[PDB]
């Protein structure tokens, strides 16, 4: 609200948020596999919608 | 509740471990001072062991890779332009010559003068 | 339903539209799987022939980088609309157990933060191409009337 | 006919479409945040635009 | 030591040079990934060697034979060191080889025929009624003038 603005044009740079983990952690590779699994199944686009 | 809550729920579903939704103390993302060289926020919680994993929109930079690791980005984004929605503005005096033309009216007036010259040349040269 | 649309006959695009969960894209995959005749093409150039010989009656779906590259090539008669449908991205590959992949990723982040990658993009996409400038607003905002009737 | 065409649809259009539209004019201004990585991006840029 | 860099002929990433018969070494090609690997070798400081894959395949695991082909299979069986190519980062490829962060994101767009302002001149004037009602109008005009005279 109040639905009064709009965004035009494409993106200007290559930005991206990802899951952070400390170095030397054993869970980073299964977390990355879970991120890839959620990306390929389109559930992230469903949550985006 | 929100996006990252369901994201952590999907992480715990597809990985099978208990989680603990905690809040950062200072409310900062992460920054390294030039003097103390001490990271703050969620970055400082991950470096100094105050946190275990951070599920939050943190910007993946080179200076943050030097202390901790990062996964692949789930949602890409970029720098955008914010303007207001163009509503109806008062057009005013420009409304009179607004439709069909901006320059062709002068051609209409010049052809009017030319046809008037032709009419005077025909009508006032018969004797 | 007038202007048809198709993808490539084999590849991960067909696996993406086939295994989609959105009902809109599900109806798209149902229409492209039940079209008469087949909207699928074998190569990219076959899709270019199928688009250019339809006079605005057929569209082709592809990657955004390839679409922006073809848009910047001769005869400069294509254009790319809409946002990205998926969060796809390419990265530098290395085998597992290699000691070089993390310094390679450090170099990738260094080239991304210094903006040299966007400079290479502007070099090999905007400057190398045979089309005009990125602003195609030459008589693309005609407000009132074409002057050819008046002429 | 054309005045009825203007009074029929009333399709309001945007004056600014691309990122080069900001450099193309000077009446409408534009800004970023006073401190942050956005200022580091626009400060250390190499593109003349 | 030396290092093997593999890729595939794709535009505009790997393109044939004009004097390809008159060139030698890694400078026989040109494009995006060539200068990308040049910047990587500049910021790291190693010698490389540009290679071309044989089968023309990117990477795929045949489930009947449980075998990978292309540059993925070249990296698994040790035929190459670092693959610098636009290879799609999927779930099935993470389990066999590693990947860096994505440098250029992309998506799926729509390609259309891009119509231009094809507005002709005099032929657009007699559009809205017909090109044949006007002749009957002129014929009825001259007929009514004959009636009046
Ligand atoms: O790993 C893959 N990487 C790919 C990379 C690219 C490119 F964009 F050139 F980098 C392309 N193209 C896009 C469309 O025009 C033809 C070439 C296809 C790829 N495919 C086949 P997919 O299965 O259809 O995605 C892969 O499998
Ligand atoms: O690591 C960082 N992550 C950030 C993440 C976000 C958000 F998008 F909310 F996730 C934002 N915002 C963008 C606009 O809405 C307000 C907050 C700022 C961030 N900043 C500050 P920057 O340096 O100016 O980018 C960081 O430093």
Curated annotation (Swiss-Prot), chain A:
Site positions (Interaction with the cone snail toxin Con-ikot-ikot): 37
Protein's cellular compartments: Cell membrane; Postsynaptic cell membrane; Postsynaptic density membrane
Induction text: Down-regulated in the pyramidal cell layer of CA1 in the hippocampus by global ischemia.
Coiled coil start-end: none
UniProt PTM: Palmitoylated. Depalmitoylated upon L-glutamate stimulation.
Tissue note: Detected in forebrain. Detected in dendrites of neuronal cells. Expressed in the pyramidal cell layers of CA1 and CA3 and in the granule cell layer of the dentate gyrus.
Function (record text): Ionotropic glutamate receptor that functions as a ligand-gated cation channel, gated by L-glutamate and glutamatergic agonists such as alpha-amino-3-hydroxy-5-methyl-4-isoxazolepropionic acid (AMPA), quisqualic acid, and kainic acid. L-glutamate acts as an excitatory neurotransmitter at many synapses in the central nervous system and plays an important role in fast excitatory synaptic transmission.
Entry's family note: Belongs to the glutamate-gated ion channel (TC 1.A.10.1) family. GRIA2 subfamily.
Extra remark: The postsynaptic actions of L-glutamate are mediated by a variety of receptors that are named according to their selective agonists. This receptor binds AMPA (quisqualate) > L-glutamate > kainate.
Domain notes: The M4 transmembrane segment mediates tetramerization and is required for cell surface expression.
Protein name: Glutamate receptor 2
Organism in which the protein naturally occurs: Rattus norvegicus
Residues of the whole record sequence present: 737 to 785 of 883
From Swiss-Prot, chain B:
Tissue: Detected in forebrain. Detected in dendrites of neuronal cells. Expressed in the pyramidal cell layers of CA1 and CA3 and in the granule cell layer of the dentate gyrus.
Coiled-coil blocks: none
PTM section of the record: Palmitoylated. Depalmitoylated upon L-glutamate stimulation.
Induction remarks: Down-regulated in the pyramidal cell layer of CA1 in the hippocampus by global ischemia.
Site (Interaction with the cone snail toxin Con-ikot-ikot): 32
Protein family per UniProt: Belongs to the glutamate-gated ion channel (TC 1.A.10.1) family. GRIA2 subfamily.
Domain notes for this protein: The M4 transmembrane segment mediates tetramerization and is required for cell surface expression.
UniProt subunit comment: Homotetramer or heterotetramer of pore-forming glutamate receptor subunits. Tetramers may be formed by the dimerization of dimers. May interact with MPP4. Forms a ternary complex with GRIP1 and CSPG4. Interacts with ATAD1 in an ATP-dependent manner. ATAD1-catalyzed ATP hydrolysis disrupts binding to ATAD1 and to GRIP1 and leads to AMPAR complex disassembly. Interacts with GRIP2. Interacts with GRIP1. Interacts with NSF via its C-terminus. Interacts with CACNG2, PICK1 and GRIP2. Interacts with GRIA1 and SYNDIG1. Part of a complex containing GRIA2, NSF and NAPA and/or NAPB.
Protein name: Glutamate receptor 2
Species the sequence originates in: Rattus norvegicus
Gene that specifies this protein: Gria2
Curated annotation (Swiss-Prot), chain C:
Positions that bind L-glutamate: 12-13, 63
Recorded family membership: Belongs to the glutamate-gated ion channel (TC 1.A.10.1) family. GRIA1 subfamily.
Sites bearing Phosphoserine, chain numbering: 54
Native source organism of the sequence: Rattus norvegicus
PTM comment, free text: Phosphorylated at Ser-54 by PKC. Palmitoylated. Depalmitoylated by CPT1C and upon L-glutamate stimulation.
Cysteine-cysteine disulfides: 76-131
Section covered of the full-length record: 657 to 807 of 907
Extracellular compartment residues: 1-149
The name this protein goes by in its record: Glutamate receptor 1
Described purpose of this protein according to its UniProt entry: Ionotropic glutamate receptor that functions as a ligand-gated cation channel, gated by L-glutamate and glutamatergic agonists such as alpha-amino-3-hydroxy-5-methyl-4-isoxazolepropionic acid (AMPA), quisqualic acid, and kainic acid. L-glutamate acts as an excitatory neurotransmitter at many synapses in the central nervous system.
Gene: Gria1
Superkingdom of source: Eukaryota
From Swiss-Prot, chain E:
UniProt similarity note: Belongs to the glutamate-gated ion channel (TC 1.A.10.1) family. GRIA1 subfamily.
Post-translational modification: Palmitoylated. Depalmitoylated by CPT1C and upon L-glutamate stimulation.
Known function: Ionotropic glutamate receptor that functions as a ligand-gated cation channel, gated by L-glutamate and glutamatergic agonists such as alpha-amino-3-hydroxy-5-methyl-4-isoxazolepropionic acid (AMPA), quisqualic acid, and kainic acid. L-glutamate acts as an excitatory neurotransmitter at many synapses in the central nervous system.
Spans traversing the lipid bilayer: 131-149
Subunit field text: Homotetramer or heterotetramer of pore-forming glutamate receptor subunits; heteromeric assembly can be the result of both receptor subtype and flip-flop forms and according the composition, one partner can be dominant with respect to the fast desensitizing current component, whereas the other can determine the steady-state component. Tetramers may be formed by the dimerization of dimers. Found in a complex with GRIA2, GRIA3, GRIA4, CNIH2, CNIH3, CACNG2, CACNG3, CACNG4, CACNG5, CACNG7 and CACNG8. Interacts with HIP1 and RASGRF2. Interacts with SYNDIG1 and GRIA2.
Comment on protein domains: The M4 transmembrane segment mediates tetramerization and is required for cell surface expression.
Tissue and organ distribution: Detected in cerebellum (at protein level).
Binding locations of L-glutamate: 86, 88, 93
Species of origin: Rattus norvegicus (Rat)
